[PDB]
Nucleic acid binder design. Structure first.
Ligand SMILES: [Zn+2]
Lengths: 123, 56, 44, 112
RNA sequence: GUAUGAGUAGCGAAAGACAGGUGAGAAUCCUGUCCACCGUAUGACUAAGGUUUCCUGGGGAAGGCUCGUCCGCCCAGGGU
RNA sequence: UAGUGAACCAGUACCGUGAGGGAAAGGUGAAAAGCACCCCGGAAGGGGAGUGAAAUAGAUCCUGAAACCGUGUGCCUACAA
RNA sequence: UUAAGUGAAUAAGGGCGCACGGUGGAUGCCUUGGCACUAGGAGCCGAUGAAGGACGGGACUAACACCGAUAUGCUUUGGGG
């Protein structure tokens, strides 16, 4: 286990960060945030393969409720809502890929408070 | 309690022997030979053995 | 907590105002004694 | 010609304790070692001593010498600049002295 | 005027995260999203009190218990 | 630090509602002739080139002692109260 | 080659000396200012509005100084060039 803050604030933080790596797939943060988001997204990709009504109804916990990502239409506004993006991409990106879906980099310390920094991307 | 005297001129240095600054783990690039950190992205090259890592 | 030096505009002009060091003969000591010091601010 | 250009930094708004640490790690090394070590520091001296060395290199070029890559930082200094004195209210109504300091910093660059 | 203790104590109650901007440089500046705290009150109006801090446009040595491209700070104009 | 408190825009700034308490702070050069232009850096700060008899006389500016803090070197030091 | 013995030097740091730098203005020297007096002048101003001030008067206006809607000044007589 790891500790950064109080009890419920960790669940707050991990709902906060991890809607990116659903939208951007690039995040610039520190050591410990990177390793916790490793474990959580290593979980929450695998529940994007099933498509069960348990998968729709456990994705509504570690994903913020309605987060838009709209760059598409035909004549519409189609809202890839960061859970439909799960169940329409991440299964059909990781159809045969086994565990270990992400990569962590080691770039730089921080100008302000000496925070060593990390890029996270998937593939 | 209270410092009984001033610390004499010897003990300033004799404390501060173990107050050094150290920088370690610096190695040449795979692309420009600049002495950069092991296990770290080059800020100028941006490579892990021939990869356009910091690139769009 | 209450503390002391509290402001008004009537009180600090009808205690330390100009008239109420003219209406007696112990502010007239204070007037000439300050004019024999060179200090500008006489009173309010 | 003559070798050994110099350049001085004046009124550097830090201490000498936090600067003499850094110039433990320069004296005895070349220019290519110098900027390499100074790029990877988590300190305030990074913005300072780098520009001091860059001015030392430009004074070695534009005025005196050639052979930029064969230059050695021979000596350097951090010296105690004029202080600045302000106060802070400590508790129970009384005062307490708290310094602010500066420094004067020079770096000597010989050829070899 | 200068040390000493000593880069020790402390940095004066409280949840933030990402992306994108201008810029020499950003955890602190701006913009966008989500989350959170109070709600007979951290919401609204006024009488004293304060005496221009208000607005517009720039700067970063000082001030700001960190930085600071920002300010109730400074410079110049303009408002009752 | 003498000499009025006060040689300087002082009974002022500043403390006290009050009556009243009241400070430190003179000196470039003989003449600003107060460093055009080049270069680093956002700047400050600097290095050349110039002024000037002299700049370690560069506007915190005449000579510049102590305490304090740096640099490098001749000799000594890990069985010692 | 064995065996018994004798054993020098290298410093993370430090001491003593020399030499060079910074932060500080003690002292050298100087005065535009003070202190005590000499010798004379002079020893009141004021309902014909005083002693003191408030406010304002310049091309540029924050202060000092001079002045007062005739306002950084009006008129006359002598010195002056
Ligand atoms: Zn490289």
């Amino acid at each position: 286990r790891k500790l950064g803050r109080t009890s419920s604030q960790r669940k707050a933080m991990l709902r906060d960060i991890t809607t990116d790596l659903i939208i951007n797939e690039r995040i610039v943060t520190t050591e410990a945030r990177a390793k916790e988001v490793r474990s959580t997204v290593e979980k929450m990709i695998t529940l994007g393969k099933r498509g069960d009504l348990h998968a729709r109804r456990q994705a509504a916990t570690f994903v913020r409720n309605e987060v838009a990502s709209v760059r598409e239409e035909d004549e519409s506004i189609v809202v890839e809502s960061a859970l439909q993006k799960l169940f329409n991409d991440l299964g059909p990106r990781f159809a045969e890929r086994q565990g270990g879906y992400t990569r962590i980099l080691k770039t730089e310390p921080r100008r302000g408070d000496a925070a060593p920094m990390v890029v996270i991307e998937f593939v | 309690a209270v410092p009984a005297r001033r610390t004499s001129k010897a003990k300033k240095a004799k404390r501060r022997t173990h107050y050094k600054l150290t920088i370690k783990g610096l190695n040449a690039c795979s692309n420009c030979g600049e002495m950069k950190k092991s296990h770290h992205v080059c800020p100028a090259c941006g490579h892990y053995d021939g990869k356009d890592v910091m690139s769009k | 907590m209450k503390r002391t030096y509290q402001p008004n505009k009537r009180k600090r002009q009808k205690v330390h105002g100009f008239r109420k060091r003219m209406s007696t003969k112990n502010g007239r000591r204070v007037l000439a004694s300050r004019r024999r010091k060179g200090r500008k601010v006489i009173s309010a | 010609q003559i070798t050994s250009a110099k350049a001085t930094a004046k009124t550097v708004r830090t201490s000498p304790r936090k600067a003499r640490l850094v110039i433990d790690l320069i004296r005895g090394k070349s220019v290519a070692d110098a900027i390499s070590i100074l790029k990877f520091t988590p300190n305030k001296s990074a913005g300072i001593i780098e520009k001091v060395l860059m001015s030392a290199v430009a004074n070695a070029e534009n005025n005196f010498d050639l052979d930029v890559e064969s230059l050695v930082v021979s000596e350097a200094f951090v010296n105690e600049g004029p202080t600045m004195k302000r106060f802070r209210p400590r508790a129970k109504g009384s005062a307490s002295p708290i310094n602010k300091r500066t420094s004067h910093i020079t770096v000597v660059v010989t050829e070899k």
